[PDB]
Structure 1
Amino acid sequence: TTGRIVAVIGAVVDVQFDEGLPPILNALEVQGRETRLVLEVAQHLGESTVRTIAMDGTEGLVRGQKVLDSGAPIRIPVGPETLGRIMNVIGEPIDERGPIKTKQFAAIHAEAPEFVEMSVEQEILVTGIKVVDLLAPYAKGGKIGLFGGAGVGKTVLIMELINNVAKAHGGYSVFAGVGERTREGNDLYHEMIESGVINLKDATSKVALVYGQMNEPPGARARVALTGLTVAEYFRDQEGQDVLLFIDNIFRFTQAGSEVSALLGRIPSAVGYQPTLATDMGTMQERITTTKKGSITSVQAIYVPADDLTDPAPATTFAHLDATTVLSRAIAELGIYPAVDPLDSTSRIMDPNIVGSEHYDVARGVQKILQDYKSLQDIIAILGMDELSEEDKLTVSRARKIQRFLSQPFQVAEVFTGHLGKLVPLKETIKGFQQILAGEYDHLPEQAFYMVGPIEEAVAKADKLAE
C-alpha cells in the first residue's frame, strides 16, 4: 500500500491510506528522502488515517508526501554476524563497515516468554565490588538494576561490571545505549576494540552493539531498547547461549514515550507521564528474561528524575528486578564511590539458604550498624557526643569505618579517583567486614579504610598515615 502524509507535528506524522490500512506496529518508509525514514504506526485514527511515530527527523517532510507500507514491524538483522558491529534502531550498520549479512531478520516487537518458560535457578554472580557483593549480590541470569539521579555513578558502575564480568564471560554480550551520551558509545566501542572484546579483523567478536542516543528524536529512543533486546533474544533462544545484556539507560525508553504522548492525544497521568507507562514498561521488561532455552543477565541503568525514587518511572521499575543497586548523591557527595546506598540496595539472593549464614550475618550486621548510626546522626549533630554511652560511640566509630571500607577505587575511574582500581574477591570482602564488626581494627584510623581494596590495604595505609 501507499499512503500520503497529511499532517506533521514533530516526531508524530499522520498518514492517509486510500486502500489497505497498515496494521498497528507496522513500519512505513517515507518516499523521496536522502536517508531512510521509518514511521512506526501507532494508532488508527479512523477515516483510513493512521497516526505514527517517526524513527528520525521530520524536517523537510511535506504534506502529501508518499509513504509505502512495508507490511511488517521494524525487523532487524539478528544472528552472530551482529557481534562486533554497531546498529541503529532500524538495524542499519552505523560503523561504516558495510552491510550486516545475517541469514535471518527479526521484528523488534514480540510477545514475552510464557509463565511455563520461566526458570528459577539462583546462582550468585560475584563482581569484585565490596558493597554489591556483600549486601546486594547479583545473580547469574537474574535482572539487575542500577538506580541513580544525574551523575551519581550509574554508567561507571556499568563500566566496571563490563570489565570485571563481561570480559571473562564465555558467551555473548549485547550493550544497547538508549538515549545516552554519544561521546560514551565512542568511548566504549574503542575500548572494546583495544581489549579485543570487539575484533575488526576476524570473527572473534563477543559483543554486539546497538545505539539510539540523546541526539535522536523521541521515536528512535522509544525503540532502540527493543532493537537491543531483540538482538539479545536471538542468542538466548536460537543459539541457547548465556547472554549478558547491558542497557544504559532504560529510563530513556519511558521518557521517549512521555515525549510524544501528548501528541498522541492522551490525558497525562501523574507527574506528566503517559497513562500507559506501566503496561508499556511491562510488555518490554517481560522479554528481558532468562528462560529454559537460554539465560540473560541484564544490567539496566535506571535514571531517577529530580533524584526522586518515587517518580512514577524509577518507582514502576523496581518490580522488574531481582537485585537493585541504589546510588545516592548524598553518599557520592561525601566522596564515597561507588555511591551505593547500603540501606536501600537489595538482592533476592540475600538469603542464608543461598549465600550462607556467614555471608548473611555479616551483611545484616553491617546494615544494622549503619542504620544504628543513621538514627544517631541527626541527634549527635545538635546534642553532641559526650552524653553517648561508650557502647554507642563505638558504633559511631565502626560505622564511620565501614562506611569507608565500602568505598573502592574502580579500575575504570582512575581518571577520577587518582587511585589504582582494586577488585576484591567475595571472601576478602566478607572477612574484612567481619573483622571491622568484630572490633579487630578499632585502633586504625577511619581514613585508613577509605579508597582501598582488601582489608590488608587498610592496615598498610594506617602505617603510611602513621606519618
Structure 2
Amino acid sequence: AGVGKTVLIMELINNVAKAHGGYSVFAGVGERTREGNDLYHEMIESGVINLKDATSKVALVYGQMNEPPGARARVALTGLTVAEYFRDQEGQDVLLFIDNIFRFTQAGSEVSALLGRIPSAVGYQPTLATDMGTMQERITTTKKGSITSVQAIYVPADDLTDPAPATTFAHLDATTVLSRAIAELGIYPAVDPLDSTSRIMDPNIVGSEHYDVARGVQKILQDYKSLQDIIAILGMDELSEEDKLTVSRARKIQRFLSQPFQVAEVFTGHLGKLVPLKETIKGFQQILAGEYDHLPEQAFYMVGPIEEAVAKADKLAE
C-alpha cells in the first residue's frame, strides 16, 4: 500500500500509450474514484480523450471502492471484454491497463462465505486460482490481434506470498516488484532489482551487452545486500580496498536506479526525466567499470541520464 503501483502505471500510459498507435483500454477495479477523475481530466487535456469528436483512443470502465462486491468482482471482466473486441475485430495492437486486478480476487473473498464456502488459507475462497485463471487466460495476445496488458497488483500486508499476488505471478511475462523498504529510503520508483523479472531478459534477445550489464548490476547489488547487516555490526575497516570499493558503486547504482517521473512532479519537486534504453545501459555500464568512482553518491540520486549526475556532482560544491 502506497509504494507506487499507480504512479508507475500512470507513467507508462504517459510514455507508451500517448505514443501508441491503436486503441487503449483502462479498467479501474476496486481503486480510488478521485483517481478516476484525476485520470479522466488528464486524458482530456492531452487530447487522448476528445469530447468534441471521434479521435479518442482510450475507452474507460470503472468499478471503484465505493461499489459493492459484485461490481468490483465483475468490472475487470467489463474492461477486458471491451479490449477483447478491439483485439479480435481489428487485430490492431490493443493496450490494456488494469488497476488493480487484486480487487477481482478480494471481491470474491468478500461474498465467499455468503455463497456457502468453507474458507481456504488466509481467508480466501477455495476457487481463487481457478477464478483467476479463467479471467487471466482471456487477457492475452493471440494469433488474431495483440494486447499489451499492464496490471497493477496489490500485495496484502506487503507479503508477496499472500495467496493472491502469489497466484498472479505465473500469469505474467514480466513482473516489476515494488518495495516499501526501498521507497522508504526515497528511491523511486521503488523497484526491487533483486525481485523484478522478465521473460525476454535473455542474451539471445536483448543481446549480450544488455544482458551482461543487467546481470552485472544485480550481482553487485546482491553482493552489497549480503554485506549490509554484516558490516553494520562489525565495521567497514576489515573490508579490503577492493570490497569497500564495490560498496561505493553498489550505492551509486542503487541511486542511479531512481528517476523522476513526469507524473510524479507533485511529489518529487523535480522535473520528470525519461531515459532511452541505450543511454541507460551506458550509464550503468560505466558505473560498474569504476569510471565515476570520483563522484559523490548523491550525484546519482534522482536524475535522468548519467550526464545529469555528473552535472549534479559539480553543483554539489556549494
Cα distance per residue 1:99-120 (max 9 Å; x no partner):
xxxxxxxxxxxxxxxxxxxxxx
Superposition deviation, residue 397 in structure 1: 0.3
SS in 1 for 2:95: strand
> Alignment partner for residue 439 of structure 1, among 264, 272, 290?
290
1:393 correspondence with 2:244: yes
Whole-Å Cα distance in 1 between the matches of residues 242 and 74 of structure 2?
Answer: 56
Q: CA deviation at 1:258?
A: 0.3
Q: What is the CA distance between 1:279 and its match in structure 2?
A: 0.2
Give the SS at the match of 2:291. Answer: coil
Deviation digits for residues 356-381 of structure 1, max 9, x if unmatched?
Answer: 11000000000000000000000010
User: How far does residue 240 in structure 1 lie from its aligned partner after superposition?
Assistant: 1.2
Cα deviation code 1:319-376 (max 9, x no counterpart): 0000000000000000000000000000000000000110000000000000000000
Measure, in 2, the Cα distance between the counterparts of 1:209 and 1:265: 34
Could you tell me the percent identity over the aligned residues? 100
Give matches, 1:16-55, under 5 Å.
none
Look up the SS of the partner of 1:310 in the other structure: coil
- Give the deviation of 1:399 after TM superposition: 0.3
Q: Deviations over 1:134-169 (max 9, x none)?
A: xxxxxxxxxxxxxxxx00000000000000100000
Give 3-state SS (helix, strand or coil) of 2:143's partner.
Answer: coil
Distance 1:328 1:262 in 2: 32
Report the Cα offset of residue 239 of structure 1. Answer: 1.4
SS at match of 1:303: coil
How many Å apart are 1:276 and its aligned residue? 0.1
TM-score by length of 1: 0.68
Q: Distance in 2 between matches of 1:285 and 1:418?
A: 38
What is the SS of the residue equivalent to 1:367?
Answer: helix
Give the distance between the partners of 1:465 and 1:155, measured in 2 at CA: 32
Q: How much has 1:395 moved relative to structure 2?
A: 1.0
Larger helix proportion of the pair? 2
Query: Offset of 1:429 from its aligned partner?
Result: 0.1
Residue 419 of structure 1 is matched in structure 2 by: 270
User: Aligned partners of 2:210, 2:91: CA distance in 1, in Å?
Assistant: 32
Q: Following TM superposition, by how much is the alpha carbon of 1:409 offset from its aligned partner in structure 2, in angstroms?
A: 0.3
Q: Deviations over 1:384-421 (max 9, x none)?
A: 10011111101110000000000000000010000000
Query: In 1, Cα distance between the equivalents of 2:89 and 2:249?
Result: 52
TM-score, L = length of structure 2: 1.00
Q: Secondary structure at the match of 1:187?
A: helix
Question: Aligned partners of 1:225 and 1:432: how far apart in 2?
Answer: 39
Query: How far apart in 1 are the matches of 2:167 and 2:174?
Result: 15
CA–CA distance in 1 between the matches of 2:136 and 2:243? 45
**Runs ≥4 residues deviating over 4 A:** none
- How far apart, CA to CA, are the structure 2 residues paired with 1:389 and 1:317? 43
RMSD: 0.4
Q: Tell me the SS of whatever aligns to 1:279.
A: helix
Distance 1:466 1:290 in 2: 52
How far, CA to CA, are the matches of 1:409 and 1:338 in structure 2? 8
SS in 1 for 2:61: strand
1:314 aligns with 2:165: yes
Cα offset for 1:466?
Answer: 2.0
Distance 1:154 1:206 in 2: 23
2: CA distance, partners of 1:418 / 1:243: 33
2:54 alignment partner in structure 1? 203
Q: How many residues align?
A: 318
C-alpha distance in 2 between matches for 1:388 and 1:239: 61
Secondary structure, aligned partner of 2:19: coil
Picking from 163, 170, 185, the partner of 2:14 is 163
Q: Deviations over 1:150-194 (max 9, x none)?
A: 000000000000001000000000000000000000000000000
Whole-Å separation in 1 of the counterparts to 2:159 and 2:107: 19
